[PDB]
Chains A and B, each alone.
Chain A
Amino acid sequence: EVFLGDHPEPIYESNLNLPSYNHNLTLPEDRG
């Protein structure tokens, strides 16, 4: 499976180098 292309290693959140996005959450501090 290493030589077929598949990754037999465990793939975690930090291996899928997914591109980070941004919606309008995580408000600033005390802005009210």
Chain B
Amino acid sequence: QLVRLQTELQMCLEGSHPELQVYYSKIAAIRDYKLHRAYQRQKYELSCINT
């Protein structure tokens, strides 16, 4: 169990083991969402200044 646990620990501290890859496709969504909101803000603001 030492072999297995430290193999997973130093195979994970790079970023490849399952647990850290189940929280990374759950936070990239949050960042993508915030960025989409920023873009929509600017889109509405500029098309307001235009008119």
Contacts and interface: CB of A to CB of B under 8 A. Distances in A.
* A and B touch in their complex, CB below 8 angstroms: yes
A27 B47 CA distance: 8
B43 to A, nearest CB: 5
Interface in B6-51: 35-36, 39, 42-43, 46-47, 49-50
Contacts of B42: 27
Contacts of A23: 50
Interface residues of A, number: 7
B46 A25 contact: yes
A31 B35 CA distance: 11
B50 A25 contact: yes
Interface of A: 23, 25-27, 30-32
